[PDB]
Design an enzyme around this catalytic site. Structure first.
Site, PDB file in Angstrom:
ATOM      1  CB  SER A  23     -22.377 -10.810 -32.093  1.00 27.04           C
ATOM      2  OG  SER A  23     -22.331 -11.669 -33.190  1.00 27.04           O
TER       3      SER A  23
ATOM      4  CE  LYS B 126     -25.444 -12.370 -34.277  1.00 25.03           C
ATOM      5  NZ  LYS B 126     -24.478 -13.440 -33.661  1.00 25.03           N
TER       6      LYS B 126
ATOM      7  CB  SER C 237     -24.003 -14.183 -29.802  1.00 24.76           C
ATOM      8  OG  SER C 237     -23.569 -13.194 -30.637  1.00 24.76           O
TER       9      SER C 237
ATOM     10  CD  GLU D  79     -22.192 -15.523 -44.722  1.00 28.80           C
ATOM     11  OE1 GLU D  79     -23.383 -14.809 -44.646  1.00 28.80           O
ATOM     12  OE2 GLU D  79     -21.981 -16.564 -44.474  1.00 28.80           O
TER      13      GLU D  79
ATOM     14  CB  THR E 186     -20.349  -8.837 -26.117  1.00 26.65           C
ATOM     15  OG1 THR E 186     -21.171 -10.099 -26.209  1.00 26.65           O
ATOM     16  CG2 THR E 186     -20.268  -8.550 -24.424  1.00 26.65           C
TER      17      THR E 186
END
Length: 267
Positions: free
Chosen positions: A46, A49, A106, A145, A212
């Site tokens: 993530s 992002k 996230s 994914e 994170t």
């Protein structure tokens, strides 16, 4: 010698939990840097992002998108881990709120909606990073994914150093103008998922913005941060970790410690 001592401590920490730590840290005031496995590839999870949110802001700055335009998705089957987009499914969200949700919570729905409609998918996200001179970052797959974190797999990876450089350019440099950079900074500052990571390695009165990433496989997790110490030039810290076994859980405390070590190394 200060570099080599930090290297000894990261090596030991990576052996203690039977994994791999990659670090890059910049003191933006002196230009001093510390790296450990800073050129090796690690899964982004993530963490990408946070760059997606910058990509959106670049579009807003170029007047290709409006930060207040309503983004509707009333019929969408929301991805798992969409805590923010699920609350506003009925009414929609402004592009701004949607982008920051992708960063701060996230949010996977926010992520995938934005990549499909505004950013031109994973290839598009990669293109944005090439455009700021980042040649390591690659996104290959969509939000849920890209978490497989398979050892040896190059998909959805970058290097600690490339992450750090990019964050420096986006958060502190000139890719975004003054007004839009400030927005990006505030988004990073209000990130909600990073309390046990880089944030836990610095004094309470230092201001931190971070994103994170946690794969949920191979104990793979990471954090990158801009840090404004009291009366001192900003720092950039990038920490990526993996572990040997598929079933190993990530270690927040390893990331925090790696950060402590990195911050001392450039002190």
């Amino acid at each position: 010698n200060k570099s080599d001592a930090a290297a000894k401590q990261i090596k030991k920490l990576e052996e203690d939990f039977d994994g791999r730590i990659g670090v890059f840290a910049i003191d933006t005031g002196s230009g001093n840097t510390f790296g450990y496995r800073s050129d090796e590839r690690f899964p982004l999870c993530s963490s990408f992002k946070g760059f997606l949110a910058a990509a959106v802001l670049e579009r807003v700055q170029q007047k290709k998108l409006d930060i207040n335009q309503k983004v509707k998705y009333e019929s969408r089957d929301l991805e798992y881990h969409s805590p923010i987009t699920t609350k506003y499914k009925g009414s929609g969200m402004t592009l701004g709120d949607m982008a920051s949700a992708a960063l701060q919570y996230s949010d996977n729905g926010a992520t995938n909606i934005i990549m499909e409609r505004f950013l031109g998918g994973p290839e598009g996200m990669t293109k944005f990073m090439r455009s700021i001179g980042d040649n390591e970052f690659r996104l290959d797959r969509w939000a849920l994914e890209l978490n497989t974190a398979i050892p040896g797999d190059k998909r959805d990876t970058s290097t600690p150093k490339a992450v750090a450089n990019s964050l420096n350019k986006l958060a502190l440099g000139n890719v975004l103008n003054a007004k839009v950079k400030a927005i990006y900074q505030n988004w990073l500052k209000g990130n909600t998922t990073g309390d046990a990571r880089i944030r836990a390695s610095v004094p309470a009165d230092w201001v931190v913005g971070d994103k994170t990433g946690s794969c949920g496989a191979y104990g793979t997790a990471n954090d990158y941060a801009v840090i404004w110490p009291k009366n001192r030039a900003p720092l950039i810290v990038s920490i990526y970790t993996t572990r040997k076994s598929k079933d190993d859980k990530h270690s927040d405390k390893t990331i925090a410690e790696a950060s402590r070590i990195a911050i001392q190394a450039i002190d």
